Amino acid sequence: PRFPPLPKTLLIISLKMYFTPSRTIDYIQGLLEPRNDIIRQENRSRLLLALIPDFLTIYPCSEAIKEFESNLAAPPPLLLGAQDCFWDSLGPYTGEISPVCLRDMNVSIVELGHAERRAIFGETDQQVARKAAAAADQGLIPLVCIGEVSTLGPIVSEAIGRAVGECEAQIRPVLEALPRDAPVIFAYEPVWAIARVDHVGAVVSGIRSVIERIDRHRKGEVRILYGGSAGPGLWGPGGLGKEVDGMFLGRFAHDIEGVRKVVREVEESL
Amino acid sequence: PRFPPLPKTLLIISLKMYFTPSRTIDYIQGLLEPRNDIIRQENRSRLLLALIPDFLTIYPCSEAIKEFESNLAAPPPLLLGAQDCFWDSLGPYTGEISPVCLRDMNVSIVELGHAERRAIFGETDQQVARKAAAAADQGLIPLVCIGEVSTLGPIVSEAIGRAVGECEAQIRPVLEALPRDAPVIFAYEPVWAIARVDHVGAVVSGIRSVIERIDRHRKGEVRILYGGSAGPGLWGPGGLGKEVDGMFLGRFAHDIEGVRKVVREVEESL
Ligand code: NA
């Protein structure tokens, strides 16, 4: 085990660039708070939460998790992610974050190729792949965001064919760059939508098929999440959970009670 | 005073993406250590050091500075910088760092437009300008890296004319975007060199002239540093200090004794 094993269900909270430091510290302390009933021992092996703060609060986030773990004797209660990293270990790359340093701060997962980075900064498939490779070199699980870049046509087979093939071009360089035994998580979100479960189910089913065709027998496990902004009710009553191994929570999740509500939803669906 | 006043001499240590977290914590604790004789009370009003760590260690760096300040009763002993920031306050910008959050962590200065970011990521003059504006909105001093993008010709007046005019295109959008009363620091390094003091002196003199021509009477103060990798002896005996208001220290500065040696050099030149 070079890598943490992946539970069947993954819930991800990415704070993007929305939170101030004090709000991030209060927030992660709310997640861990036992009276908040978000993190249950009985969920440990089936359901996992990741918090993905901005780079500045990874340190005190990591410190908060540790302090909470020291309350018990020796799955972590909560995974800590970063929202990006560089494609090299250490070096002369001003403004860039090292996966070496991330691992030293007990980050377990790195979000890569977000739609926002692809649109604003022109981040490419090759770059996301090299980034995944460097994250994996440090024992970090790549979490690669994928999705169709085009507005799709009105013929469904054409539309599903395009979307899946556009995801294929994003998946292939990542799997080529990664060791076959390193785990990877792909988060799907159709970039032109800014949640149709029929559409998600169909493209995700085409994604899993794509992966099986490239490397059916790789030892590293694979998970496909919904990367879109998911609201209360979508997972269970909306059927989203029948299609994917997890999801990103939308901005309702900025309130701890919202997160509590969605964990309950997820428990009920299992 | 919306901004810290700028001393006549600025020394900058940017760690780029070279240091692990424990090495950064040890390092800043070495800078502050009184037996290391790097930070002298007698230097306070004439010479200032900035440390510019990676985003992950800004928090414990800030914490270390505070803890040291609490050893005395209420110029900071050491400025804390970041190596980049985003051009907006808060929002949906995955992987980006907010100048709001930086200020909340007692960062006083933001390095922008580094040659490494301009080359690797295609970072543009417009983007560096918008970044400077957002840093200034939060009371942060922009530190904009500038320099000629071309290999220069063999006729000196042509070469100096080009280099200065290429710096002009980088300076102008920054001054346009900044309030006239916000301070700005420009760090010069000819991108094609990968230290000729004659060349630096000549282009820096053309830079100060350029600035005076754009906005002779702005209230915000301006400093021009050498952004190249400066080694021991270059400032005083090499004459660099007669041309610029400070410099970036080269990799020799990774050793605390190196920093000590260069502070002594600088003291002697004043
Ligand atoms: Na970045």
Phi first, then psi: give them for residue A109, nearest 5 degrees.
-150, 145
Q: Note whether A184 and A174 are within 8 A (CB).
A: yes
**Domain CATH number, residue B158:** 3.20.20.70
Q: Tell me the β-bridge partners of B109.
A: B81, B141
For residues A203 and A185, what is the distance between their CA atoms, to the nearest angstrom?
16
CB-based burial, A213-237: b 16+ in 10 Å, e otherwise = eeeeebebebbbbbbbbbbbebbbe
Task: Give the C-alpha distances (Å, rounded to integers) separating B217 from B129, B172, B211, B245.
Answer: 20, 15, 10, 19
- H-helix or E-strand spanning residue A9: strand A9-14
Catalytic residue among B111, B123, B189, B243: B189
| Yes or no, beta carbons of A101 and B20 under 8 Å apart | yes
User: Cβ contacts of residue B232 below 8 Å, gap of 6+?
Assistant: B252, B258, B261, B262, B265
Nearest to B38 by CA among B222, B266, B191, B269: B266
**Residue A182 φ/ψ, nearest 5 degrees:** -85, 135
CB B177 within 8 A of CB B129: yes
Can you read off the two tokens belonging to residue A260? 């509590």
CB B198 within 8 A of CB B242: no
Q: With contact defined as beta carbons under 8 Å apart, do A234 and A11 qualify?
A: no
What residues does A239 pair with on adjacent strands? Answer: none
* Alpha carbons A10 and A46: distance in angstroms, whole number: 9
Sign, CA torsion A134/B50/B241/B30: negative
Partners of residue B117 in chain A, C-beta under 8 Å: 94-95
Nearest CA to A138 among A105, A163, A103, A113? A103
Measured at the CA of A269, the angle between CA A267 and CA A270, to 5 degrees, comes to: 70
Locate B245 and state its tokens. 């208001």
3-state DSSP helix/strand/coil % of chain A, to nearest 5: 45, 15, 35
Evaluated on CA atoms A242, A244, A246, A250, the torsion sign reads: negative
Tokens read off for B222: 């301006």
- What H or E segment, with its residue span, contains residue A265? helix A256-269
Residue A41 carries which side chain, given as an amino acid letter? Q
Ligand 1 center–CA B85 separation, angstroms: 9
| CB neighbour class for A41 (10 Å; exposed up to 12, middle 13-18, buried from 19) | exposed
Residue B77, amino acid: P
Residue with structure tokens 């417009």?
Answer: B126
Measured on CA atoms in the order B155, B156, B159, B164, is the torsion positive or negative?
negative
Least CB-CB distance to B56: which of A58, A84, A95? A58
**A192 min Cα distance to partner chain B (Å):** 16
CA of B133 to the centre of ligand 1 (A): 18
Task: Domain of residue A165: give its range.
Answer: 1-270
Contact predicate A190/A229, CB 8 Å: no
The answer to whether residues B87 and B131 touch, using CB atoms and an 8 Å cutoff, is yes
Q: What total of structural domains would you count in chain B?
A: 1
Tokens of B23: 């090495």
Output the known binding site of B for substrate.
Answer: 16
Nearest to B225 by CA among B131, B114, B136, B145: B145
Q: How far apart are CA B178 and CA A121, in angstroms?
A: 23
Are A79 and A50 within 8 A, CB to CB?
Answer: yes
List the catalytic residue out of B114, B166, B199, B243: B114
Rg of chain A in Å (alpha carbons): 18
DSSP B23: H
The number of residues making up chain A comes to: 270
Determination technique for this entry: X-ray
B114 is catalytic: yes
